[PDB]
Amino acid sequence: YAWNRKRISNCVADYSVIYNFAPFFAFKCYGVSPTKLNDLCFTNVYADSFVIRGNEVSQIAPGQTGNIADYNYKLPDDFTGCVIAWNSNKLDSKPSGNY
Amino acid sequence: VIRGNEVSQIAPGQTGNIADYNYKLPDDFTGCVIAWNSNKLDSKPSGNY
Amino acid sequence: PTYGVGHQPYRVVVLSFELLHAPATVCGPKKSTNLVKNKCVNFNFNGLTG
């Protein structure tokens, strides 16, 4: 409900260094190939970050319905870019309860 | 044996590091790809090099 | 073994099948049948059907 937004502009972006920073399963990108990002280039780049649970990972998609997609965070229908998600049970969990 | 970030690179028409410099598949490739986790055999606490 | 799930090692086995016009050598457990001629019938000659 309070996700940050970082403006990224005037940058030489190498997208092969992301795989050495976080241990994710899939580099899920909708409108562009993940490995083709070096050749083509665009104008403005945005970065968002939030922590959700495992049940509502699939709701971060264009044209999706759910609790998060209606009341927390909604994606546009014509979204292009990359969505990166990975499990964080080793950092965001406590034996007394992470509240 | 490859890491978890290069599992999707073993595919026909794929670009990356393993698909470009280590193991390249043909475009008309027929067959099956089998992958499973091996953290109990290929990992060591002192460093499996 | 203390790494994340995205950096764990994975054993990958890739099987390739040579589907060409050469005579077959690798065929599984399916029994053969006595042939029949001069009457129209389904035939499985050389794997190809008709």
UniProtKB/Swiss-Prot annotation, chain B:
Residues 3-5 are annotated as: Integrin-binding motif. It comes from the Viruses. Attaches the virion to the cell membrane by interacting with host receptor, initiating the infection. The major receptor is host ACE2. When S2/S2' has been cleaved, binding to the receptor triggers direct fusion at the cell membrane. When S2/S2' has not been cleaved, binding to the receptor results in internalization of the virus by endocytosis using host TFRC and GRM2 and leading to fusion of the virion membrane with the host endosomal membrane. Alternatively, may use NRP1/NRP2 and integrin as entry receptors. Binds to host ACE2. RBD also interacts with the N-linked glycan on 'Asn-90' of ACE2. Cleavage of S generates a polybasic C-terminal sequence on S1 that binds to host Neuropilin-1 (NRP1) and Neuropilin-2 (NRP2) receptors. Interacts with host integrin alpha-5/beta-1 (ITGA5:ITGB1) and with ACE2 in complex with integrin alpha-5/beta-1 (ITGA5:ITGB1). May interact via cytoplasmic c-terminus with M protein. May interact (via N-terminus) with host bilirubin and biliverdin, thereby preventing antibody binding to the SARS-CoV-2 spike NTD via an allosteric mechanism. This is Spike protein S1. It comes from Severe acute respiratory syndrome coronavirus 2. The lineage of its organism: Viruses, Riboviria, Orthornavirae, Pisuviricota, Pisoniviricetes. The chain holds residues 401 to 449 of 1273 of the full protein.
